[PDB]
Amino acid sequence: SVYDAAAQLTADVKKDLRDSWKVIGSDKKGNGVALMTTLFADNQETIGYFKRLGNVSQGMANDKLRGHSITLMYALQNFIDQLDNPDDLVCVVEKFAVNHITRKISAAEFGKINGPIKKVLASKNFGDKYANAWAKLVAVVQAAL
Amino acid sequence: SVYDAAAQLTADVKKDLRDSWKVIGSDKKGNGVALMTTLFADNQETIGYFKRLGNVSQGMANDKLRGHSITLMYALQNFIDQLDNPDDLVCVVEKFAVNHITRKISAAEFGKINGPIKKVLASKNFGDKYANAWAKLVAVVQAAL
Ligand code: HEM
Ligand code: HEM
């Protein structure tokens, strides 16, 4: 259950998620676009899903991609703010899960985001521990897909 | 143009939007659900659009409505954060405009949100000036619909 998965976020995982978010979340435009262009660079098979955004190679210059990337960073901002209350975390997670289910995105495919997160965090000197905490949050979303 | 409308947000309007957001945005769950239940109470003709959320009369207890309301408050959080840069404000606005165009929501209907905003702001002792500033931001989104 998304509920059980959500419950797996211990005080230590929450602390790591918050501390790292202080840095990655402080530049939603830059880090959001980085997460996206890295997703496309390492998983080219996912590009076809983002047909609405036009030419994603354009990176930052592509307004649709930029508008999408900033908005995504707020979904994460939403999750981070709901950590202390699993009931609210679960409903926001389920709301976004529906956005992906309607696009035929499976739990396995959604998990491809773990690669980019590991790199973005790395470029900010946050090691494996942080990458692992972020995988646990992504796992709560996967429990809903 | 959404661009022109966005340009209409002067230093004074931005200040009022930020100051009032300090209070309304500090309780996204509560104020978000208030904006929604007030929208449904004063504009019953809009309820049919929210079929996915189930029984909206359930208010806070309805997780789908709660998940939707918190997420909406982040869209506004997104707009407020992009005020200083019209280029980023325009792309996030256009991203959300598409979410409404696909649901057949016209600029006039989207404007119905001005009523609820005026009330939510009022219950926090923010008068007409603030309600007017918020109408100008809602106007930027309307320029895109
Ligand atoms: C940290 C992880 C992720 C978050 C928080 C996230 C967040 C979002 C958000 C907020 C939207 C917009 C929803 C809407 O307005 O309809 C969205 C759409 C979408 N996401 Fe994700 N997403 C993530 C990872 C992924 C992954 C791994 C895939 C790739 C297989 C994916 C595929 C999609 C698709 C296809 C769309 C539609 C794009 C469009 O046409 O606008 N997402 N996502
Ligand atoms: C302050 C104003 C508003 C904001 C920022 C806003 C924001 C949002 C957001 C973020 C979504 C979710 C997008 C998605 O992932 O599908 C959404 C969906 C939607 N909005 Fe709005 N909205 C606003 C006002 C309105 C108004 C006035 C109407 C009513 C006529 C409306 C109708 C809809 C509909 C029909 C949906 C789909 C609900 C669902 O099936 O989940 N919105 N809105």
mmCIF file with all atom_site columns, N, CA and C in Angstrom, chain A residues 3 28-29 52 63-64 66-68 70-71 74 77-78 81-82 85 87-88 91-92 94-96 98-99 103, chain B residues 28-29 52 63-64 66-68 70-71 74 77-79 81-82 85 87-88 91-92 94-96 98-99 103:
data_model
loop_
_atom_site.group_PDB
_atom_site.id
_atom_site.type_symbol
_atom_site.label_atom_id
_atom_site.label_alt_id
_atom_site.label_comp_id
_atom_site.label_asym_id
_atom_site.label_entity_id
_atom_site.label_seq_id
_atom_site.pdbx_PDB_ins_code
_atom_site.Cartn_x
_atom_site.Cartn_y
_atom_site.Cartn_z
_atom_site.occupancy
_atom_site.B_iso_or_equiv
_atom_site.pdbx_formal_charge
_atom_site.auth_seq_id
_atom_site.auth_comp_id
_atom_site.auth_asym_id
_atom_site.auth_atom_id
_atom_site.pdbx_PDB_model_num
ATOM 1   N N  . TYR A 1 3   ? 0.237   3.570  1.546   1.00 0.00 ? 3   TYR A N  1
ATOM 2   C CA . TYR A 1 3   ? 0.221   3.874  2.955   1.00 0.00 ? 3   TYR A CA 1
ATOM 3   C C  . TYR A 1 3   ? 1.352   3.258  3.716   1.00 0.00 ? 3   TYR A C  1
ATOM 4   N N  . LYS A 1 28  ? 14.619  25.666 -8.660  1.00 0.00 ? 28  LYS A N  1
ATOM 5   C CA . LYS A 1 28  ? 13.692  24.804 -9.357  1.00 0.00 ? 28  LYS A CA 1
ATOM 6   C C  . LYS A 1 28  ? 13.804  24.840 -10.879 1.00 0.00 ? 28  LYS A C  1
ATOM 7   N N  . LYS A 1 29  ? 14.115  25.998 -11.449 1.00 0.00 ? 29  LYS A N  1
ATOM 8   C CA . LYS A 1 29  ? 14.227  26.096 -12.895 1.00 0.00 ? 29  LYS A CA 1
ATOM 9   C C  . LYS A 1 29  ? 15.436  25.318 -13.384 1.00 0.00 ? 29  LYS A C  1
ATOM 10  N N  . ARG A 1 52  ? 4.008   16.365 -26.194 1.00 0.00 ? 52  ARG A N  1
ATOM 11  C CA . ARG A 1 52  ? 3.405   17.690 -26.045 1.00 0.00 ? 52  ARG A CA 1
ATOM 12  C C  . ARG A 1 52  ? 4.431   18.806 -25.857 1.00 0.00 ? 52  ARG A C  1
ATOM 13  N N  . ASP A 1 63  ? 10.163  26.619 -23.934 1.00 0.00 ? 63  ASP A N  1
ATOM 14  C CA . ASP A 1 63  ? 9.314   27.051 -22.832 1.00 0.00 ? 63  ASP A CA 1
ATOM 15  C C  . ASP A 1 63  ? 8.419   25.960 -22.283 1.00 0.00 ? 63  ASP A C  1
ATOM 16  N N  . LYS A 1 64  ? 7.910   25.087 -23.142 1.00 0.00 ? 64  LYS A N  1
ATOM 17  C CA . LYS A 1 64  ? 7.059   24.024 -22.645 1.00 0.00 ? 64  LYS A CA 1
ATOM 18  C C  . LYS A 1 64  ? 7.831   23.122 -21.701 1.00 0.00 ? 64  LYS A C  1
ATOM 19  N N  . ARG A 1 66  ? 10.523  24.061 -20.002 1.00 0.00 ? 66  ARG A N  1
ATOM 20  C CA . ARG A 1 66  ? 10.847  24.863 -18.830 1.00 0.00 ? 66  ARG A CA 1
ATOM 21  C C  . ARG A 1 66  ? 9.635   24.976 -17.898 1.00 0.00 ? 66  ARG A C  1
ATOM 22  N N  . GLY A 1 67  ? 8.457   25.176 -18.479 1.00 0.00 ? 67  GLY A N  1
ATOM 23  C CA . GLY A 1 67  ? 7.245   25.287 -17.685 1.00 0.00 ? 67  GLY A CA 1
ATOM 24  C C  . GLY A 1 67  ? 6.906   23.981 -16.991 1.00 0.00 ? 67  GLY A C  1
ATOM 25  N N  . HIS A 1 68  ? 7.235   22.875 -17.651 1.00 0.00 ? 68  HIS A N  1
ATOM 26  C CA . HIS A 1 68  ? 6.991   21.548 -17.102 1.00 0.00 ? 68  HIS A CA 1
ATOM 27  C C  . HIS A 1 68  ? 7.980   21.215 -15.986 1.00 0.00 ? 68  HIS A C  1
ATOM 28  N N  . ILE A 1 70  ? 9.695   23.315 -14.013 1.00 0.00 ? 70  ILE A N  1
ATOM 29  C CA . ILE A 1 70  ? 9.511   24.108 -12.808 1.00 0.00 ? 70  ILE A CA 1
ATOM 30  C C  . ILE A 1 70  ? 8.333   23.529 -12.037 1.00 0.00 ? 70  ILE A C  1
ATOM 31  N N  . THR A 1 71  ? 7.267   23.213 -12.764 1.00 0.00 ? 71  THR A N  1
ATOM 32  C CA . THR A 1 71  ? 6.067   22.664 -12.137 1.00 0.00 ? 71  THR A CA 1
ATOM 33  C C  . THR A 1 71  ? 6.342   21.320 -11.452 1.00 0.00 ? 71  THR A C  1
ATOM 34  N N  . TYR A 1 74  ? 7.689   21.547 -8.053  1.00 0.00 ? 74  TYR A N  1
ATOM 35  C CA . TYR A 1 74  ? 6.723   21.918 -7.023  1.00 0.00 ? 74  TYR A CA 1
ATOM 36  C C  . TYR A 1 74  ? 5.982   20.685 -6.528  1.00 0.00 ? 74  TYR A C  1
ATOM 37  N N  . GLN A 1 77  ? 8.118   19.670 -4.047  1.00 0.00 ? 77  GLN A N  1
ATOM 38  C CA . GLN A 1 77  ? 8.005   20.623 -2.948  1.00 0.00 ? 77  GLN A CA 1
ATOM 39  C C  . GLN A 1 77  ? 6.791   20.247 -2.114  1.00 0.00 ? 77  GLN A C  1
ATOM 40  N N  . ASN A 1 78  ? 5.751   19.791 -2.804  1.00 0.00 ? 78  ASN A N  1
ATOM 41  C CA . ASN A 1 78  ? 4.488   19.375 -2.199  1.00 0.00 ? 78  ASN A CA 1
ATOM 42  C C  . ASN A 1 78  ? 4.735   18.136 -1.331  1.00 0.00 ? 78  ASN A C  1
ATOM 43  N N  . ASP A 1 81  ? 6.766   18.959 1.853   1.00 0.00 ? 81  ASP A N  1
ATOM 44  C CA . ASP A 1 81  ? 5.951   19.630 2.853   1.00 0.00 ? 81  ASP A CA 1
ATOM 45  C C  . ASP A 1 81  ? 4.952   18.712 3.548   1.00 0.00 ? 81  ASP A C  1
ATOM 46  N N  . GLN A 1 82  ? 4.566   17.611 2.914   1.00 0.00 ? 82  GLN A N  1
ATOM 47  C CA . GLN A 1 82  ? 3.595   16.683 3.521   1.00 0.00 ? 82  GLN A CA 1
ATOM 48  C C  . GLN A 1 82  ? 4.206   15.510 4.284   1.00 0.00 ? 82  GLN A C  1
ATOM 49  N N  . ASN A 1 85  ? 2.812   14.366 7.774   1.00 0.00 ? 85  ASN A N  1
ATOM 50  C CA . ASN A 1 85  ? 1.453   13.856 7.841   1.00 0.00 ? 85  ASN A CA 1
ATOM 51  C C  . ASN A 1 85  ? 1.199   12.906 6.693   1.00 0.00 ? 85  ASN A C  1
ATOM 52  N N  . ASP A 1 87  ? -1.216  11.117 5.931   1.00 0.00 ? 87  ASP A N  1
ATOM 53  C CA . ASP A 1 87  ? -2.535  11.158 5.305   1.00 0.00 ? 87  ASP A CA 1
ATOM 54  C C  . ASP A 1 87  ? -2.577  12.165 4.167   1.00 0.00 ? 87  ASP A C  1
ATOM 55  N N  . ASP A 1 88  ? -1.883  13.282 4.341   1.00 0.00 ? 88  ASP A N  1
ATOM 56  C CA . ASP A 1 88  ? -1.851  14.293 3.299   1.00 0.00 ? 88  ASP A CA 1
ATOM 57  C C  . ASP A 1 88  ? -0.860  13.870 2.221   1.00 0.00 ? 88  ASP A C  1
ATOM 58  N N  . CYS A 1 91  ? -2.655  11.483 -0.188  1.00 0.00 ? 91  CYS A N  1
ATOM 59  C CA . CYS A 1 91  ? -3.610  12.031 -1.148  1.00 0.00 ? 91  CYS A CA 1
ATOM 60  C C  . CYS A 1 91  ? -2.948  12.843 -2.270  1.00 0.00 ? 91  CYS A C  1
ATOM 61  N N  . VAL A 1 92  ? -1.860  13.551 -1.981  1.00 0.00 ? 92  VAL A N  1
ATOM 62  C CA . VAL A 1 92  ? -1.173  14.302 -3.038  1.00 0.00 ? 92  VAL A CA 1
ATOM 63  C C  . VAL A 1 92  ? -0.477  13.316 -3.957  1.00 0.00 ? 92  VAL A C  1
ATOM 64  N N  . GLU A 1 94  ? -1.416  10.270 -4.589  1.00 0.00 ? 94  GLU A N  1
ATOM 65  C CA . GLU A 1 94  ? -2.413  9.626  -5.426  1.00 0.00 ? 94  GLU A CA 1
ATOM 66  C C  . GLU A 1 94  ? -2.912  10.557 -6.524  1.00 0.00 ? 94  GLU A C  1
ATOM 67  N N  . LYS A 1 95  ? -2.915  11.866 -6.257  1.00 0.00 ? 95  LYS A N  1
ATOM 68  C CA . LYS A 1 95  ? -3.356  12.841 -7.249  1.00 0.00 ? 95  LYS A CA 1
ATOM 69  C C  . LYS A 1 95  ? -2.365  12.823 -8.407  1.00 0.00 ? 95  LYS A C  1
ATOM 70  N N  . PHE A 1 96  ? -1.075  12.901 -8.098  1.00 0.00 ? 96  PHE A N  1
ATOM 71  C CA . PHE A 1 96  ? -0.074  12.878 -9.154  1.00 0.00 ? 96  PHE A CA 1
ATOM 72  C C  . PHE A 1 96  ? 0.050   11.501 -9.805  1.00 0.00 ? 96  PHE A C  1
ATOM 73  N N  . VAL A 1 98  ? -2.322  9.630  -10.621 1.00 0.00 ? 98  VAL A N  1
ATOM 74  C CA . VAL A 1 98  ? -3.336  9.600  -11.674 1.00 0.00 ? 98  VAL A CA 1
ATOM 75  C C  . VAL A 1 98  ? -2.840  10.310 -12.940 1.00 0.00 ? 98  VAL A C  1
ATOM 76  N N  . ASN A 1 99  ? -2.056  11.370 -12.780 1.00 0.00 ? 99  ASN A N  1
ATOM 77  C CA . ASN A 1 99  ? -1.516  12.081 -13.938 1.00 0.00 ? 99  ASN A CA 1
ATOM 78  C C  . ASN A 1 99  ? -0.612  11.173 -14.766 1.00 0.00 ? 99  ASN A C  1
ATOM 79  N N  . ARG A 1 103 ? -1.252  8.459  -18.567 1.00 0.00 ? 103 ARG A N  1
ATOM 80  C CA . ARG A 1 103 ? -0.260  8.519  -19.646 1.00 0.00 ? 103 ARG A CA 1
ATOM 81  C C  . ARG A 1 103 ? 0.415   7.159  -19.833 1.00 0.00 ? 103 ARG A C  1
ATOM 82  N N  . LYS B 1 28  ? -2.056  25.679 3.227   1.00 0.00 ? 28  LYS B N  1
ATOM 83  C CA . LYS B 1 28  ? -2.525  25.213 1.942   1.00 0.00 ? 28  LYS B CA 1
ATOM 84  C C  . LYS B 1 28  ? -3.676  24.220 2.009   1.00 0.00 ? 28  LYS B C  1
ATOM 85  N N  . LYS B 1 29  ? -3.670  23.345 3.010   1.00 0.00 ? 29  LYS B N  1
ATOM 86  C CA . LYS B 1 29  ? -4.743  22.365 3.133   1.00 0.00 ? 29  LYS B CA 1
ATOM 87  C C  . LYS B 1 29  ? -6.061  23.051 3.467   1.00 0.00 ? 29  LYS B C  1
ATOM 88  N N  . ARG B 1 52  ? -14.277 13.599 -11.308 1.00 0.00 ? 52  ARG B N  1
ATOM 89  C CA . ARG B 1 52  ? -13.238 12.686 -10.834 1.00 0.00 ? 52  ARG B CA 1
ATOM 90  C C  . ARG B 1 52  ? -13.048 12.709 -9.318  1.00 0.00 ? 52  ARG B C  1
ATOM 91  N N  . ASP B 1 63  ? -10.603 12.554 0.265   1.00 0.00 ? 63  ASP B N  1
ATOM 92  C CA . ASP B 1 63  ? -9.174  12.635 -0.043  1.00 0.00 ? 63  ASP B CA 1
ATOM 93  C C  . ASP B 1 63  ? -8.871  13.187 -1.414  1.00 0.00 ? 63  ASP B C  1
ATOM 94  N N  . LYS B 1 64  ? -9.676  12.817 -2.399  1.00 0.00 ? 64  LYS B N  1
ATOM 95  C CA . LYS B 1 64  ? -9.439  13.331 -3.743  1.00 0.00 ? 64  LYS B CA 1
ATOM 96  C C  . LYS B 1 64  ? -9.552  14.856 -3.775  1.00 0.00 ? 64  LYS B C  1
ATOM 97  N N  . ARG B 1 66  ? -9.157  16.817 -1.140  1.00 0.00 ? 66  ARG B N  1
ATOM 98  C CA . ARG B 1 66  ? -8.069  17.336 -0.322  1.00 0.00 ? 66  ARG B CA 1
ATOM 99  C C  . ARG B 1 66  ? -6.747  17.324 -1.101  1.00 0.00 ? 66  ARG B C  1
ATOM 100 N N  . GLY B 1 67  ? -6.516  16.253 -1.861  1.00 0.00 ? 67  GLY B N  1
ATOM 101 C CA . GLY B 1 67  ? -5.291  16.144 -2.639  1.00 0.00 ? 67  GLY B CA 1
ATOM 102 C C  . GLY B 1 67  ? -5.242  17.166 -3.759  1.00 0.00 ? 67  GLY B C  1
ATOM 103 N N  . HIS B 1 68  ? -6.418  17.475 -4.295  1.00 0.00 ? 68  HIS B N  1
ATOM 104 C CA . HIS B 1 68  ? -6.556  18.442 -5.364  1.00 0.00 ? 68  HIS B CA 1
ATOM 105 C C  . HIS B 1 68  ? -6.362  19.865 -4.842  1.00 0.00 ? 68  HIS B C  1
ATOM 106 N N  . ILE B 1 70  ? -4.738  20.907 -2.084  1.00 0.00 ? 70  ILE B N  1
ATOM 107 C CA . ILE B 1 70  ? -3.377  21.206 -1.658  1.00 0.00 ? 70  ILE B CA 1
ATOM 108 C C  . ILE B 1 70  ? -2.516  21.470 -2.890  1.00 0.00 ? 70  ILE B C  1
ATOM 109 N N  . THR B 1 71  ? -2.707  20.648 -3.918  1.00 0.00 ? 71  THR B N  1
ATOM 110 C CA . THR B 1 71  ? -1.935  20.789 -5.150  1.00 0.00 ? 71  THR B CA 1
ATOM 111 C C  . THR B 1 71  ? -2.233  22.125 -5.845  1.00 0.00 ? 71  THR B C  1
ATOM 112 N N  . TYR B 1 74  ? -0.290  24.954 -4.643  1.00 0.00 ? 74  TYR B N  1
ATOM 113 C CA . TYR B 1 74  ? 1.106   24.989 -5.067  1.00 0.00 ? 74  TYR B CA 1
ATOM 114 C C  . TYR B 1 74  ? 1.228   25.646 -6.432  1.00 0.00 ? 74  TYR B C  1
ATOM 115 N N  . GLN B 1 77  ? 1.496   28.970 -5.481  1.00 0.00 ? 77  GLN B N  1
ATOM 116 C CA . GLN B 1 77  ? 2.824   29.132 -4.892  1.00 0.00 ? 77  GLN B CA 1
ATOM 117 C C  . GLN B 1 77  ? 3.844   29.315 -6.011  1.00 0.00 ? 77  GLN B C  1
ATOM 118 N N  . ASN B 1 78  ? 3.611   28.592 -7.107  1.00 0.00 ? 78  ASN B N  1
ATOM 119 C CA . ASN B 1 78  ? 4.457   28.615 -8.298  1.00 0.00 ? 78  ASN B CA 1
ATOM 120 C C  . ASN B 1 78  ? 4.374   30.007 -8.938  1.00 0.00 ? 78  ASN B C  1
ATOM 121 N N  . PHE B 1 79  ? 3.152   30.507 -9.120  1.00 0.00 ? 79  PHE B N  1
ATOM 122 C CA . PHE B 1 79  ? 2.956   31.828 -9.720  1.00 0.00 ? 79  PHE B CA 1
ATOM 123 C C  . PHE B 1 79  ? 3.634   32.921 -8.883  1.00 0.00 ? 79  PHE B C  1
ATOM 124 N N  . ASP B 1 81  ? 6.101   32.699 -6.859  1.00 0.00 ? 81  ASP B N  1
ATOM 125 C CA . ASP B 1 81  ? 7.556   32.615 -6.954  1.00 0.00 ? 81  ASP B CA 1
ATOM 126 C C  . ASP B 1 81  ? 8.115   33.095 -8.283  1.00 0.00 ? 81  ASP B C  1
ATOM 127 N N  . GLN B 1 82  ? 7.293   33.103 -9.330  1.00 0.00 ? 82  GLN B N  1
ATOM 128 C CA . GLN B 1 82  ? 7.748   33.544 -10.661 1.00 0.00 ? 82  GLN B CA 1
ATOM 129 C C  . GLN B 1 82  ? 7.429   35.001 -11.002 1.00 0.00 ? 82  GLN B C  1
ATOM 130 N N  . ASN B 1 85  ? 10.099  37.319 -12.686 1.00 0.00 ? 85  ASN B N  1
ATOM 131 C CA . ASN B 1 85  ? 10.528  36.986 -14.030 1.00 0.00 ? 85  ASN B CA 1
ATOM 132 C C  . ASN B 1 85  ? 9.351   36.611 -14.905 1.00 0.00 ? 85  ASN B C  1
ATOM 133 N N  . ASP B 1 87  ? 9.100   35.876 -17.925 1.00 0.00 ? 87  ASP B N  1
ATOM 134 C CA . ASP B 1 87  ? 9.291   34.779 -18.869 1.00 0.00 ? 87  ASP B CA 1
ATOM 135 C C  . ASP B 1 87  ? 8.977   33.434 -18.230 1.00 0.00 ? 87  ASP B C  1
ATOM 136 N N  . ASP B 1 88  ? 9.316   33.285 -16.956 1.00 0.00 ? 88  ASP B N  1
ATOM 137 C CA . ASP B 1 88  ? 9.036   32.041 -16.276 1.00 0.00 ? 88  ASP B CA 1
ATOM 138 C C  . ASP B 1 88  ? 7.582   32.031 -15.863 1.00 0.00 ? 88  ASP B C  1
ATOM 139 N N  . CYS B 1 91  ? 5.508   30.806 -18.856 1.00 0.00 ? 91  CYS B N  1
ATOM 140 C CA . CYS B 1 91  ? 5.538   29.389 -19.198 1.00 0.00 ? 91  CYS B CA 1
ATOM 141 C C  . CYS B 1 91  ? 4.793   28.498 -18.193 1.00 0.00 ? 91  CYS B C  1
ATOM 142 N N  . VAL B 1 92  ? 4.841   28.823 -16.904 1.00 0.00 ? 92  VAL B N  1
ATOM 143 C CA . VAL B 1 92  ? 4.110   28.019 -15.916 1.00 0.00 ? 92  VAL B CA 1
ATOM 144 C C  . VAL B 1 92  ? 2.619   28.269 -16.104 1.00 0.00 ? 92  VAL B C  1
ATOM 145 N N  . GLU B 1 94  ? 1.125   29.048 -18.886 1.00 0.00 ? 94  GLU B N  1
ATOM 146 C CA . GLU B 1 94  ? 0.680   28.334 -20.065 1.00 0.00 ? 94  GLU B CA 1
ATOM 147 C C  . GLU B 1 94  ? 0.564   26.830 -19.826 1.00 0.00 ? 94  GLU B C  1
ATOM 148 N N  . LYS B 1 95  ? 1.403   26.301 -18.942 1.00 0.00 ? 95  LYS B N  1
ATOM 149 C CA . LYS B 1 95  ? 1.356   24.882 -18.623 1.00 0.00 ? 95  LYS B CA 1
ATOM 150 C C  . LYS B 1 95  ? 0.023   24.591 -17.941 1.00 0.00 ? 95  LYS B C  1
ATOM 151 N N  . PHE B 1 96  ? -0.329  25.383 -16.932 1.00 0.00 ? 96  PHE B N  1
ATOM 152 C CA . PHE B 1 96  ? -1.592  25.160 -16.243 1.00 0.00 ? 96  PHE B CA 1
ATOM 153 C C  . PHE B 1 96  ? -2.790  25.532 -17.102 1.00 0.00 ? 96  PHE B C  1
ATOM 154 N N  . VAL B 1 98  ? -3.157  24.841 -20.134 1.00 0.00 ? 98  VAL B N  1
ATOM 155 C CA . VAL B 1 98  ? -3.451  23.647 -20.919 1.00 0.00 ? 98  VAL B CA 1
ATOM 156 C C  . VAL B 1 98  ? -4.272  22.632 -20.117 1.00 0.00 ? 98  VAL B C  1
ATOM 157 N N  . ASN B 1 99  ? -4.026  22.554 -18.809 1.00 0.00 ? 99  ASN B N  1
ATOM 158 C CA . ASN B 1 99  ? -4.779  21.635 -17.952 1.00 0.00 ? 99  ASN B CA 1
ATOM 159 C C  . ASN B 1 99  ? -6.254  22.010 -17.924 1.00 0.00 ? 99  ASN B C  1
ATOM 160 N N  . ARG B 1 103 ? -10.034 20.559 -20.355 1.00 0.00 ? 103 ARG B N  1
ATOM 161 C CA . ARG B 1 103 ? -11.262 20.276 -19.610 1.00 0.00 ? 103 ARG B CA 1
ATOM 162 C C  . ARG B 1 103 ? -12.385 21.221 -20.052 1.00 0.00 ? 103 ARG B C  1
#
